[PDB]
Design a protein around this ligand. Sequence first.
Ligand SMILES: *[C@@H]1O[C@H](CO)[C@@H](O)[C@H](O)[C@H]1NC(C)=O
Ligand SMILES: *[C@@H]1O[C@H](CO)[C@@H](O)[C@H](O)[C@H]1NC(C)=O
Lengths: 86, 24, 49
Amino acid sequence: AYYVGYLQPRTFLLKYNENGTITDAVDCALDPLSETKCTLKSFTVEKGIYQTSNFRVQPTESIVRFPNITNLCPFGEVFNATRFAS
Amino acid sequence: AYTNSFTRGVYYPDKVFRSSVLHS
Amino acid sequence: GVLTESNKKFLPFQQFGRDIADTTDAVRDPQTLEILDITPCSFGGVSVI
Ligand SMILES: *[C@@H]1O[C@H](CO)[C@@H](O)[C@H](O)[C@H]1NC(C)=O
Ligand SMILES: *[C@@H]1O[C@H](CO)[C@@H](O)[C@H](O)[C@H]1NC(C)=O
């Protein structure tokens, strides 16, 4: 029996111990508390309100518009004419 | 079968020593 | 800088260290493989009285 997981491009905050080893880590896009810890760059948060990021609505599609009619052009009478010159 | 990986999967991203430093 | 016999211990895979803002505070020599610490030599201002 073995377990298989996957890796994605996330961001982590690591707490290095005095001896140099890693003793605790915090994911940065797991919970709003995680974003608060990332922005504060600390593992503990006190009471209050903190701005962590910004919310932007992204565009959905694109539209292009132009004059209603198209001025039509004599190619129909230049190509399909009765007679041409020599 | 499925299982929840609680907090595993953390390593040393670089070969630089650090001590008592909070690094992102 | 001025080199000194470092007291902190390195895991067998690092090469140097830093504390804040890429300030290299330690290094290991490539030949003796001994962990040394780096600190700048003294500097300061001058005043006339
Ligand atoms: C750091 O390592 C030393 C030597 O093994 C040990 O005595 C000390 O307890 C360690 N410190 C921590 C916080 O683990
Ligand atoms: C380099 O060679 C010297 C002797 O030639 C030896 O004392 C030293 O341990 C060696 N260091 C490495 C990193 O190979």
